[PDB]
Amino acid sequence: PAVEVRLDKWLWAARFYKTRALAREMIEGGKVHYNGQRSKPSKIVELNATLTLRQGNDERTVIVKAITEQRRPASEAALLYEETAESVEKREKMALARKLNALT
């Protein structure tokens, strides 16, 4: 089955975490959810799955659009998923509010 890529490898390939070991720690900390639930490092990624993950102190919800074992460049990896519009908005709004409480 050459259509089986682990969630920890995937998260690293997609550049969400610097190393697979870190991606594995985040998963085990419950900081990454797969279709709304705790997952595991060895979970095989499926196209269109919904992943919710912690980025520093940001939360992003992305939909898996491609699977690969290669970690490509910044702009290139970024193409293995599509962040949801609701996720981008939530992030923005929190960022804005941050900059607001700042100018006050």
Swiss-Prot record:
Top-level division of the source organism's lineage: Bacteria
A cellular component annotation (GO) from this entry: cytosol
Keyword list, A-Z: DNA-binding, RNA-binding, Stress response
Q: State the conditions that upregulate or repress this gene.
A: By heat shock.
The GO terms describing molecular function are: DNA binding; ribosomal large subunit binding; single-stranded RNA binding
- For this chain's UniProt record, which GO biological process terms are given? cellular response to heat; response to heat
Question: S4 RNA-binding domain location, by residue?
Answer: 5-67
What family does this belong to? Belongs to the HSP15 family.
Q: How does it assemble?
A: Monomer.
Q: What does this protein do?
A: Involved in the recycling of free 50S ribosomal subunits that still carry a nascent chain. Binds RNA more specifically than DNA. Binds with very high affinity to the free 50S ribosomal subunit. Does not bind it when it is part of the 70S ribosome.
Record's protein name: Heat shock protein 15
Gene name, per UniProt, is hslR
State start and end of the fragment within the whole protein.
5 to 108 of 133
